[PDB]
């Protein structure tokens, strides 16, 4: 049923465009990642991976 909007409406009735981001961060091949520079890989030495 109709969901019309009027500018004269006060708070709590004005339209509220919403975008919700769903994440699935888990042990799986990662495709979306942040802007962190990749460094060279080192073996047989203690590092903060």
């Amino acid at each position: 049923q109709s969901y019309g909007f009027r500018p004269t409406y006060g708070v709590g009735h004005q339209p509220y465009r919403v975008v919700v981001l769903s994440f699935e961060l888990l042990h799986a091949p990662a495709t979306v990642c942040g802007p962190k520079k990749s460094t060279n890989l080192v073996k047989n030495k203690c590092v903060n991976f």
Binding site: H27, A28, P29
Partner: peptide
């Protein structure tokens, strides 16, 4: 046509992407 059968033991996959060895892990 149509007929019935017994599934035996089958239809088991890897629920998760993590790796295990000599582990008796259980999952729901």
């Amino acid at each position: 046509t149509q007929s019935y059968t017994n599934s035996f033991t089958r239809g088991v996959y890897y629920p998760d992407k993590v790796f295990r060895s000599s582990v008796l892990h259980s999952t729901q």
